[PDB]
Amino acid sequence: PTYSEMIAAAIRAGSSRQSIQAYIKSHYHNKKEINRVLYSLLAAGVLKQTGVPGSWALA
Amino acid sequence: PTYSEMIAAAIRAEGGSSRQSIQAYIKSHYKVNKKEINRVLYSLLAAGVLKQTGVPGSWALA
DNA sequence: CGCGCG
DNA sequence: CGCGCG
């Protein structure tokens, strides 16, 4: 479905960008593209950051 | 001339040079983006040709 | 190496 | 907004 729901499913299943990226490919693109979506949701209040590497979780 | 030669020439003409300073000098003396300049500046930093002196940081010969 | 950057 | 990154 939409990238936000696929990322939400990855977190439900603190998850990193690499974890989220691997969940989407193995269940359903490049590091830059996924990062843009992750930071767009962070700007909108859907996600929260917890570093190096970037760990993501649902707000 | 090579990027190292253009960058050095930009640094000497400064009256301590910023990336935009080096970029503007090159673009009006030879008319040759941000990633390509920073690639060379930070490479010449690694080889000891240049030194940093902040945000975005100023460049100078070593 | 965190990088998403326009 | 520092970004050079591969």
Author numbering:
A (entry chain A): 27 to 39, 45 to 59, 63 to 64, 1169 to 1178, 76 to 85, 87 to 88, 1192, 92 to 93, ...
B (entry chain B): 27 to 41, 45 to 61, 64, 1169 to 1178, 76 to 85, 87 to 88, 1192, 92 to 93, ...
Show the paper's wording.
We chose GH5, the globular domain of the linker histone H5, as a target B-DNA binder to engineer into a Z-DNA binding protein because a structural analysis of GH5 showed that it has a high structural homology with hZαADAR1. Similarly, we mutated five residues of GH5 (K41G, S42G, R43G, K53A and R95A) to improve the solubility of the GH5/DNA complex (referred to as GH5* hereinafter). To obtain detailed structural information of the interaction between engineered GH5* chimera and Z-DNA, we determined the crystal structure of one of the B-to-Z converting mutants, GH5*:α3NADAR1-PW, in complex with [d(TCGCGCG)]2 at a resolution of 2.75 Å. Two protein molecules and one duplex DNA molecule, [d(TCGCGCG)]2, are present in an asymmetric unit of the crystal lattice. In this complex, DNA was shown to form typical Z-conformation with alternating anti- and syn-conformations of nucleotides and was structurally well aligned to the hZαADAR1-bound Z-DNA, demonstrating that this GH5* chimera successfully achieved Z-conformation-specific DNA binding in the same manner as hZαADAR1. The well-conserved interactions are mediated by N1173, R1174, and Y1177 of the α3 helix of this chimera, which are derived from hZαADAR1. Whereas the overall structural alignment between GH5*:α3NADAR1-PW and hZαADAR1 gives an RMSD of 2.1 Å, the RMSD value for the alignment of the Z-DNA binding interface including the α3 helix and the β-wing is only 0.80 Å. In contrast, the overall alignment of GH5*:α3NADAR1-PW with free GH5 gives a smaller RMSD value than the local alignment involving only the α3 helix and the β-wing (1.2 Å versus 3.3 Å). This large structural deviation in local alignment is caused by a 19.5° rotation of an α3 helix toward Z-DNA in the GH5*:α3NADAR1–PW/Z–DNA complex structure. Our complex structure of a GH5* chimera demonstrated successful engineering of GH5, a B-DNA binder, into a Z-DNA binder by introducing a few Z-DNA contacting residues on the α3N and in a β-wing, while maintaining the overall structural integrity of the wHTH motif of GH5.
Left-handed Z-DNA is radically different from the most common right-handed B-DNA and can be stabilized by interactions with the Zα domain, which is found in a group of proteins, such as human ADAR1 and viral E3L proteins. In general, Zα domains can both bind to the preformed Z-DNA with a high affinity as a Z-DNA binder and shift the B–Z equilibrium of a potential Z-forming DNA toward Z conformation (referred to as B–Z transition) as a B–Z converter. In this study, we successfully converted the B–Z transition-defective Zα domain, vvZαE3L, into a B–Z converter by improving B-DNA binding ability, suggesting that B-DNA binding is involved in the B–Z transition. In addition, we engineered the canonical B-DNA binding protein GH5 into a Zα-like protein having both Z-DNA binding and B–Z transition activities by introducing Z-DNA interacting residues.
